[PDB]
């Protein structure tokens, strides 16, 4: 069950009921490519604040297609879809409801928890290692080495 870029756009449309399987009125194909471009640029900016999540970019001179494999796991689908929906609601001149906002916030927090990393502070490097460590067997034992590279 690979996740395609076009499935996220369809999910975003269905969630706010712009268009669905039983809509009786569907959007033009240009809106689909607009949504795909918006998703691509949103991931491009997500490369900065959140960590990379394995998104597949259309490297080269080509352009994204709605049938291209995203590369994301299924667990990020709701988060990405809700964020994209919040990004592109104003395209159709609408306004999100508080429940949608809460759902998007919950999914985003779940993603942040999944991608969390906490650094550990190393010692300065002028700290004297204790005499009880037998500090004349290896180097960087008389004093701590500090951060490497």
């Amino acid at each position: 069950t690979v996740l395609t870029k076009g499935e996220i756009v369809l999910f975003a449309l269905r969630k706010f009921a712009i268009a669905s399987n039983a809509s009786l009125t569907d959007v033009e194909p240009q809106s689909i490519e607009d949504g795909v471009n918006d998703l691509e640029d949103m991931m491009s900016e997500w490369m900065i604040n959140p960590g990379d999540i394995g998104y597949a970019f259309a490297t080269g001179d080509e352009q994204p297609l709605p049938d291209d494999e995203s590369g994301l796991p299924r667990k990020y689908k709701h988060a990405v879809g809700y964020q994209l929906l919040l990004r592109m609601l104003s395209d159709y001149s609408l306004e999100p409801t508080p429940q949608v906002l809460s759902n998007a916030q919950r999914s985003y927090d779940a993603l942040m928890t999944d991608t969390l990393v906490v650094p550990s502070m190393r010692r300065r490097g002028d700290f004297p290692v204790g005499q009880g460590n037998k500090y004349d067997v290896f180097t960087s034992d008389r004093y701590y080495p500090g951060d490497l590279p």
Partner: protein
């Protein structure tokens, strides 16, 4: 004592807080607390410290 912060408050800025004792920064950057509608409800200071 260890400061306590939120994930959305320090994300992307961890390297500055990690080396605050080796380097000599003029200041430390941190964000504010925002609700689901984007309104600011708390300042950029850390929430608290451990006892």
């Amino acid at each position: 004592q260890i400061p306590i912060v939120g994930m959305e408050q320090i994300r992307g800025l961890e390297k500055h807080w990690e080396a605050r004792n080796k380097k000599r920064p003029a200041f430390l950057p941190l964000r504010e607390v925002r609700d689901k509608s984007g309104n600011i409800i708390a300042g950029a200071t850390p929430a608290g410290y451990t006892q």
